[PDB]
Each structure stands twice: as structure tokens, then as C-alpha cells.
Scaffold this active site. Structure first.
Site, PDB file in Angstrom:
ATOM      1  N   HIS A   1       2.733 -14.994  -2.747  1.00 46.12           N
ATOM      2  CA  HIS A   1       4.165 -13.199  -2.822  1.00 46.12           C
ATOM      3  C   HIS A   1       3.780 -12.740  -1.992  1.00 46.12           C
ATOM      4  O   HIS A   1       4.996 -11.946  -1.907  1.00 46.12           O
ATOM      5  CB  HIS A   1       4.194 -13.370  -4.093  1.00 46.12           C
ATOM      6  CG  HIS A   1       2.706 -12.436  -5.238  1.00 46.12           C
ATOM      7  ND1 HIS A   1       1.396 -12.153  -5.815  1.00 46.12           N
ATOM      8  CD2 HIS A   1       2.121 -10.739  -4.650  1.00 46.12           C
ATOM      9  CE1 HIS A   1       0.994 -11.555  -6.083  1.00 46.12           C
ATOM     10  NE2 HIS A   1       1.251 -10.568  -5.157  1.00 46.12           N
TER      11      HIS A   1
ATOM     12  N   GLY B   1      -1.822  -3.955  -6.129  1.00 50.52           N
ATOM     13  CA  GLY B   1      -2.485  -3.505  -4.667  1.00 50.52           C
ATOM     14  C   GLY B   1      -4.186  -4.547  -5.126  1.00 50.52           C
ATOM     15  O   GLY B   1      -3.939  -4.553  -3.923  1.00 50.52           O
TER      16      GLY B   1
ATOM     17  N   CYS C   1      -3.640  -7.707  -5.675  1.00 54.24           N
ATOM     18  CA  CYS C   1      -4.009  -8.978  -5.308  1.00 54.24           C
ATOM     19  C   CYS C   1      -4.235  -9.442  -4.231  1.00 54.24           C
ATOM     20  O   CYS C   1      -5.021  -9.000  -3.571  1.00 54.24           O
ATOM     21  CB  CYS C   1      -2.639  -9.315  -5.275  1.00 54.24           C
ATOM     22  SG  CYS C   1      -2.086  -9.085  -7.187  1.00 54.24           S
TER      23      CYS C   1
END
Ligand SMILES: CNC(=O)C1(N2C[C@]3(CCN(c4cncc5ccccc45)C3=O)c3cc(Cl)ccc3C2=O)CC1
Ligand SMILES: CNC(=O)C1(N2C[C@]3(CCN(c4cncc5ccccc45)C3=O)c3cc(Cl)ccc3C2=O)CC1
Ligand SMILES: [Cl-]
Lengths: 306, 305
Positions: free
Chosen positions: A41, A143, A145
Site C-alpha cells: 500500500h 507511519g 507500517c
């Protein structure tokens, strides 16, 4: 003596964390050898998140659209591919700090250390368990991920989790290092929810054995139970069923303390019925389920305080 | 979202751990520049521990009596000296992995990360606090002496604790990196005990603010209190007194949540007097006191190192 929620030393994983940027999106990446692994993503905008078509979004990207930063050094992306929900970026430099490692997919009830990261920089380390509902009760902000979960038994790092999202109840969802999600979750902003969670029974039993080892026996009783009668009671308290595999797994702890597994199950049945009556077990007023039988053996002394 | 007992990333400290051996005793050492720091009791036999004269035991040792091992490499000891309860072994090689560091002495209520080690090899990392009685509730076995406690301020590691012993109640005692003990303890096998402990009030309040930030608000009420009335109640429950400094320190958390410090103190008073009535706060049935106001701000902001 003492019993703490203990994480593995994080140094071997700290040396693998990088920042990955695609346009305006920035998250964390794991740099092992000449490949950087990160959530797919990173190629999405907020508008793409409802129904992203990752294959269509990716085909429009070149190698030079991915900015990878390791410390203060830019790595050069020379290739890219998607494997399930993970993006694999081939870079022109092998990580000189790459430890001995393996990618392992874990089962619910298993524990691991999380190295929470922001902008490629490690911020903290904590212990977690894969819940029976396939979510984790982590501590993550926007932030985070691409932050990873791992175990380091015998100097080899076994990577088991990569962080992808936070569900509406504040719990977290992610994948193994091959991009396969844990649970029925998708890397899509469609309405999703964590299923009803249960308590990890084998872990609570392991933690009761840790308390006996450290010198505490107040919760034991003169009774035993059958496995089936224990399970009928456990499920009334939202505890996971205890299987013959779990009983076998608790064998060494049962031998070290001299308390049969079904005798410990009788103690657990009584604890669920009575509560603790102002007492604590290993400094906790709740029954702990985020220590596995293996964690207890690793941390506790091999000599029981009789 | 979420709130966990979080330690600092331990990598900078892992690269400093070595094994120190004197005769039959093996423990851990901290290798910074060309000096290895370790507990001075490494020079004692089990009998020596009963009443040791450390200067007399040390004068009988040569540099070669100390075996220092860094990974699979033997370090050459070229000098030795004692500073309080710590032994400083001068080695022939400066640690190439020496981070930016400082030795700092912490106060009770302060938290730190412990890197538990055995045979010079790190085994685990956990967070803990210096109790008001100067002990720490650690997790240590035989072989863990010389394991260190630390915090990270940007890129600088502030070493604050070196492990020396376990008291009869299973709690732990040690020194700062200058060898001064925290608490009225001595490095001798003689009758010693942890004193009566108290709860770190400012930390409980910080953790209540962390719970509010995370959506746990059931314990909030319309009431407020004075600092003096709160302290009279806190004393009754073996809680440490709350000072104006603690109130000032909780300012940012009070502004972010809109709950004044004395408003949060009224919530804490009701919890002490009535309990939780079957409820939990951040997954705990006990009031947690091992998170400082700074720890709460750091975890609820994602500060990196
Ligand atoms: C809580 N989530 C959100 O508010 C939003 N969201 C964003 C996101 C990516 C970052 N991210 C977070 C990951 N961990 C912690 C977080 C904490 C606070 C905000 C976000 C966090 C996500 O969950 C995401 C990723 C995927 Cl693969 C699928 C969906 C989402 C998603 O729903 C914004 C809408
Ligand atoms: C519990 N301690 C002991 O039974 C003994 N003991 C030993 C010791 C050194 C190691 N060590 C421990 C340190 N942390 C954890 C431990 C767990 C289990 C055994 C020991 C441990 C000590 O406390 C020590 C150091 C100093 Cl400076 C002063 C006295 C002692 C001491 O009394 C053996 C007699
Ligand atoms: Cl597993």
C-alpha cells in the site's frame, strides 16, 4: 527470580530498517541482502485505499519512482515485484548488517517481539502475541507500517510479522514476510472488524507454571479434571479450547514442578470461578496469556523454588 | 492506538557487552572505548563474599588473571582499577562499536531499559523503574551480573544501572556506572532486605492520561481536589507524595486531554477508595506506576532513535 514481559534484543533487526517512499506516501522497509520488503500500500494514495487495484497501480511505476533511504544514504532500486500484499524492491547494495534469518508464518497463541519504527528509524521494542482472532494488541501510530515482528532463538532472526493496519477497535493486522495476511483481513479501506477474541488457555497454564517455579502455589487445589470437562468450563469464560497438543506441550513444565497438566487445569477452573480475592500472580491481578510454554522455559530458572 | 510496556531499541548496548572471567567466576562487562566496566565481586570466591576486602583481593591479581571475551575474540587486559563497587579493566583495543554515551545516576520513579545478558551474550530486553525503596523488579538469574540499564536521548545512550545482586524477596539491587549503589545495600553476602515500597504517584497519573488518550475514560469524574487533600489520601494508601514539580511535569498531558492534574488526582482518589469495580484500565486490574510522564509522551508521539 522475577518474571517480566521480555523482548528479544532488537539490534539485529535495527540494522535492517529503512524508509520507503513512493510519491507522497512514506513507510518502513526491511532490508535483507539486496531486497527491501514493505507493505504494497506504499503505492496507494488515500483515495486508492477503498478499492485499490494494486496490479494497475504498480504497472505505472518504474524503479526510480521508489525512494529507499538507509540511514542518510539513498539506495538505488534496480527491480520490483509484488508477492501477495508485500512489495519486494531489488536494490544495488546488499545490506552489510544482514543477520542470519528465516521467514516463518506463526499460529495464534505464538509470541514475538515488535520493533516499532517511523521513517525507517526504530523507536521502541515490545512483546506481543498473535491473538486467536488473528489480530495483535500492538502500540502503533500512523507511519508505523512496515515495522516487523520477530523471534531470535539461537542467533538466527525468524521474521514473522509485518505491520499493515489498525482496525476500528484499536487492534492491529498484518502479514507474514511472504505477504499473506494473518486472518480474514485485506489491505483495503473497506469496513472490516476484529472477530470476538478469546483467551489463550495454553499460555495462561504456562504462566501458572512460571509462578509455581518462582515460588508461588496459593492457587493450587486438591482437585483434577478431565480434558473435556475443563473445555466445557473454559469456553463459558471465553477461553480457547485446550487440545491434546497443548497438554503434550506443557509436559516439561509439568515434570519440573511435579504438577500434572489436568491438575493445573483444575487450578485454572477454580481461578476463573473465584477470581484472585486480593492476591496477585507474578505481580498481576489478571490471568496473563501472552507467555508461551517456550517463553516460560526460556526466562524461568531450571530449578523450582520448592 | 495501543499502549505497551516499551523498551528502547537495544542495538547500541548489545555492541558493548562482553564476558569477564576471574578464576571460577564469570559475569558480564560493558566495553566502552578501551575500558571494560563490571561488578567488583567478579574477584570473589563464595567464601570471600561473606566479608570481602576488595583492595586486598585485587592487589593479588594481575592483568592476565582477567579473561575478557568479546564475541569469539579475547581482549588483552593491560590495566585494572576499582571505582566504588565497579572494576575498570583497561584493554588494548578500543570498542569499534562504542556509541555516544554518558553515565547518569537516576532518581526513584525513573524508568530504564534493561538488556539482560549471560556469558557476554544479550538474552532479552525489558523495561523497569527504580522503585522508591531503590530496588528494581527485574528478571535475572545467576550469571546476569554486569547486565546494564539505560535510556536513549536522541543518539546518546545514558547508562544508569549495572546489576549486582538479588534480595530475598526476588527483587534486584545494583549500582550506577560509577559503582555507587542505589539503596542502602553492600556487595557482600550478609543479611540484607528490600525496605517497604511505595507507589510512584506521578507515574500512575501519567498512565491514567495515557488511558484517556487511548479512549479509556470511565474513571473520570466532575470533581477536583487540592494538592494537600490529595497528599493526605495518597499517604494513607502508601503512595508517594505528589509535589508541585510533579504537577508541572504533567502539564502537557493535562493540556492535551483537557483534564487538569488535580482533576486527574480526584479520579485517582476515587479509584483508591472504591477500587475498579470489575473494570480495567489499559488491560490492567491494578494501577500501573512504571511509565513516567515522558514515557507516555514518547509512546503517544513515536519518537525515534
Ligand atoms: C486506523 N486507520 C485509519 O484511520 C486509516 N487507514 C490507514 C492505514 C495505513 C496506516 N494505518 C495505521 C497503522 N497502524 C496504526 C495506525 C494508527 C493510527 C492511524 C493509522 C494507523 C492504517 O490503518 C490503512 C492501511 C491499510 Cl492496508 C488498510 C486500511 C488503512 C486505514 O484504514 C486512515 C484510514
Ligand atoms: C540470591 N543470591 C544468592 O543466593 C547468592 N548471592 C550471589 C550474588 C551474585 C549473583 N546474584 C544474583 C543476581 N541476580 C539474580 C540471581 C538469581 C539467583 C541467584 C543469584 C542471583 C547474587 O545475588 C550476590 C552478589 C552480591 Cl554483590 C552480594 C550477594 C550475593 C548473593 O547473596 C548466592 C548467595
Ligand atoms: Cl507458531
Amino acid at each position: 527470580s522475577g518474571f517480566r514481559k521480555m523482548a528479544f534484543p532488537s539490534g539485529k533487526v535495527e540494522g535492517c530498517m529503512v524508509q520507503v517512499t513512493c510519491g507522497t506516501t512514506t513507510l518502513n522497509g526491511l532490508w535483507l541482502d539486496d531486497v527491501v520488503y514493505c507493505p504494497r500500500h506504499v503505492i496507494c494514495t488515500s483515495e486508492d485505499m477503498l478499492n485499490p487495484n494494486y496490479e494497475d497501480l504498480l504497472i505505472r511505476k518504474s524503479n526510480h519512482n521508489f525512494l529507499v533511504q538507509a540511514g542518510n544514504v539513498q539506495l538505488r532500486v534496480i527491480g520490483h515485484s509484488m508477492q501477495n500484499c508485500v512489495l519486494k524492491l531489488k536494490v544495488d547494495t546488499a545490506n552489510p548488517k544482514t543477520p542470519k534469518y528465516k521467514f516463518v508464518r506463526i499460529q495464534p497463541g505464538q509470541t514475538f517481539s515488535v520493533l516499532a519504527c517511523y521513517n525507517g528509524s526504530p523507536s521502541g521494542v515490545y512483546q506481543c502475541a498473535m491473538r486467536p482472532n488473528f489480530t495483535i494488541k500492538g502500540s502503533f501510530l500512523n507511519g508505523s507500517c512496515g515495522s516487523v515482528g520477530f523471534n531470535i532463538d539461537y542467533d538466527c532472526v525468524s521474521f514473522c510479522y509485518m505491520h499493515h493496519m489498525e482496525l476500528p477497535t484499536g487492534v492491529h493486522a498484518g502479514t507474514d514476510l511472504e505477504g499473506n495476511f494473518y486472518g480474514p483481513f485485506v489491505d483495503r479501506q473497506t469496513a472490516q472488524a476484529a472477530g470476538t477474541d478469546t483467551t489463550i488457555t495454553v499460555n495462561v497454564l504456562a504462566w501458572l507454571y512460571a509462578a509455581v517455579i518462582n515460588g508461588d502455589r496459593w492457587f493450587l487445589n486438591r482437585f483434577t479434571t478431565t480434558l473435556n470437562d475443563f473445555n466445557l468450563v473454559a469456553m463459558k469464560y471465553n477461553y480457547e479450547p485446550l487440545t491434546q497438543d497443548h497438554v503434550d506441550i506443557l509436559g516439561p513444565l509439568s515434570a519440573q514442578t511435579g504438577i500434572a497438566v489436568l491438575d493445573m487445569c483444575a487450578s485454572l477452573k477454580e481461578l476463573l470461578q473465584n477470581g484472585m480475592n486480593g492476591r496477585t500472580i507474578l505481580g498481576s491481578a489478571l490471568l496473563e496469556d501472552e507467555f508461551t510454554p517456550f517463553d516460560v522455559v526460556r526466562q524461568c530458572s531450571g530449578v523450582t523454588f520448592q
